[PDB]
Amino acid sequence: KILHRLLQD
Amino acid sequence: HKILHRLLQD
Amino acid sequence: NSLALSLTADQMVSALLDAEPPILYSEYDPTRPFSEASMMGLLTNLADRELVHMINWAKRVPGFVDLTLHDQVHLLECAWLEILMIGLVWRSMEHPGKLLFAPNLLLDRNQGKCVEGMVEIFDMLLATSSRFRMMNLQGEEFVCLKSIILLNSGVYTFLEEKDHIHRVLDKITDTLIHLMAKAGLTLQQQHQRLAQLLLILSHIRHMSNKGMEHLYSMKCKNVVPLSDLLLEMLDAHRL
Amino acid sequence: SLALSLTADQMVSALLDAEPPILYSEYDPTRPFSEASMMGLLTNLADRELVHMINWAKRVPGFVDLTLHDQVHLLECAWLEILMIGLVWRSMEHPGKLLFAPNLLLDRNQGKCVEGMVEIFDMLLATSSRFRMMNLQGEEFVCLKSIILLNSGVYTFLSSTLKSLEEKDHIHRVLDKITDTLIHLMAKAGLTLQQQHQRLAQLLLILSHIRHMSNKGMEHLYSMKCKNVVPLSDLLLEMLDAHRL
Numbered sequence A: 001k002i003l004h005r006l007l008q009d
Numbered sequence B: 001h002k003i004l005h006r007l008l009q010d
Numbered sequence C: 001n002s003l004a005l006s007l008t009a010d011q012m013v014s015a016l017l018d019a020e021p022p023i024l025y026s027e028y029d030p031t032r033p034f035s036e037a038s039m040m041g042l043l044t045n046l047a048d049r050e051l052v053h054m055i056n057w058a059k060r061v062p063g064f065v066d067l068t069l070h071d072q073v074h075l076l077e078c079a080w081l082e083i084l085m086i087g088l089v090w091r092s093m094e095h096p097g098k099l100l101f102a103p104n105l106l107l108d109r110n111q112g113k114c115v116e117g118m119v120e121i122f123d124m125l126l127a128t129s130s131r132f133r134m135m136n137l138q139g140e141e142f143v144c145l146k147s148i149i150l151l152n153s154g155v156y157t158f159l160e161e162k163d164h165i166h167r168v169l170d171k172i173t174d175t176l177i178h179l180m181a182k183a184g185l186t187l188q189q190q191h192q193r194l195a196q197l198l199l200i201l202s203h204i205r206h207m208s209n210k211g212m213e214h215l216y217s218m219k220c221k222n223v224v225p226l227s228d229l230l231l232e233m234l235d236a237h238r239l
Numbered sequence D: 001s002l003a004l005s006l007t008a009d010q011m012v013s014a015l016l017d018a019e020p021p022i023l024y025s026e027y028d029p030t031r032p033f034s035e036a037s038m039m040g041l042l043t044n045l046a047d048r049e050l051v052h053m054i055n056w057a058k059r060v061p062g063f064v065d066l067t068l069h070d071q072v073h074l075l076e077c078a079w080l081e082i083l084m085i086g087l088v089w090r091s092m093e094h095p096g097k098l099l100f101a102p103n104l105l106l107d108r109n110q111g112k113c114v115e116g117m118v119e120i121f122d123m124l125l126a127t128s129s130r131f132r133m134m135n136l137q138g139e140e141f142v143c144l145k146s147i148i149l150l151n152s153g154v155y156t157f158l159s160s161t162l163k164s165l166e167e168k169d170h171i172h173r174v175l176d177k178i179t180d181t182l183i184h185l186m187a188k189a190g191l192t193l194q195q196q197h198q199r200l201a202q203l204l205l206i207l208s209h210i211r212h213m214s215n216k217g218m219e220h221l222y223s224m225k226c227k228n229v230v231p232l233s234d235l236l237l238e239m240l241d242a243h244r245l
């Protein structure tokens, strides 16, 4: 999930 | 002749 | 001048409590198990019959008859499912995990799975009832919130008509604050609670939009015949 | 949570500083509009704004106190409401027009370029008109938008088994402080105590209409993706699939 990765990056 | 229309009038 | 704009807070509450529609019964035969079709029929039968009481309740909302017939139609077409839903949620408050559509029709979330795509709706309604319970929503607050929905949900879609509505909406806000002051809440808690109650209306709007699409989905699947009144309230949201 | 020890002034200041930037469109103004090109310009814009939104959320006091899972859930729920309220804010001083970007200002009739879209324009425009009617201030705008982030998905947190509403105390505590902040801002602007609760309710009832527009907008975007009018970014496809329709 893109949102997931963007949130932790 | 919308039913709501009639119900509101009466 | 007007009439609602000269009501005190106590009189607003008294008026709203008096306008309240009765709690209707379902024609449910409790000796027979549900089908998808029987469930839908029961629920739409009930809703159709509540619609008739709602229209008559709406005329009893202070400041509602001041509006043109076509503005009255517009507000009800927009808020009707929101009004039925908050009603349902309010009735189900003291029944954790259950939805009291009628006193003789109290359903669990697993019975939402009788109708295709219905359990997702049930869960949102159950969640809202749980939240009412968490806040210990009061009946006087409830009636205020329901009148707010009627007057608010379509007011942007309309301007003395719109400024009048906003004056009435401010009186209801005063009434809500009045009840909180009366309950002994501090200034800060009154402001907080008001916000908490009104933010619930955002979730109720969401449930209405989702329920509207489900109901329309159930109309195409033609599992049960809907009444003309229900069809017209529904078709008002299409397009 | 240090977000709970913030004063009203610190909350406002923190939210103002977290504000994402206003982005530009790639629109070539010497080129014509078609249903597909307009949808392309808008979704492209949205996708880029989304990345700035995610980093804005991380700057909203108390948001990072939440699990990654809760964060994801909230943003998935609020994203369109948050894009739209910013749009309406940007368009306040352009009556009858929507300022999607400084180089992408469209009037109502330009909405008719996309099938089904003018209905959405009309709602955004009426909301913009309400912002003007109320004389909405930027400080209130950032409070409203943060409230949307924390509130919109808060009652859709269900337990894995039994699916009963999960109590999110911290989220409600933050929302309560934003309420404290809004009132403070109104008292400082000289609104009477009575005007404060009236203006508070007026601002919050706006969110009901923003939800409505979000759901109708979501259905419209969904309709286009399914008619293959415009290709959507993976981020956009995923933000859309988090919803039901």
Ligand SMILES: CC1=C[C@@H](C)[C@]2(CO)CO[C@@H](c3ccc(O)cc3)[C@H]1[C@H]2C
Binding pocket: C040, C043, C044, C046, C047, C050, C084, C085, C087, C088, C101, C118, C121, C211, C212, C214, C215
């Ligand atoms: C009017 C309705 C009929 C049924 C079919 C649905 C389908 O999901 C379930 O919830 C319904 C409802 C809501 C409130 C009420 O007082 C009665 C029925 C609402 C619908 C969303």
Ligand SMILES: CC1=C[C@@H](C)[C@]2(CO)CO[C@H](c3ccc(O)cc3)[C@H]1[C@H]2C
Binding pocket: D042, D043, D045, D046, D049, D083, D084, D086, D087, D100, D117, D120, D217, D218, D220, D221
């Ligand atoms: C992101 C959007 C999706 C659908 C709802 C529409 C078309 O109806 C496409 O793009 C619009 C939009 C809104 C706000 C924003 O910040 C960027 C684009 C907005 C809508 C105008």
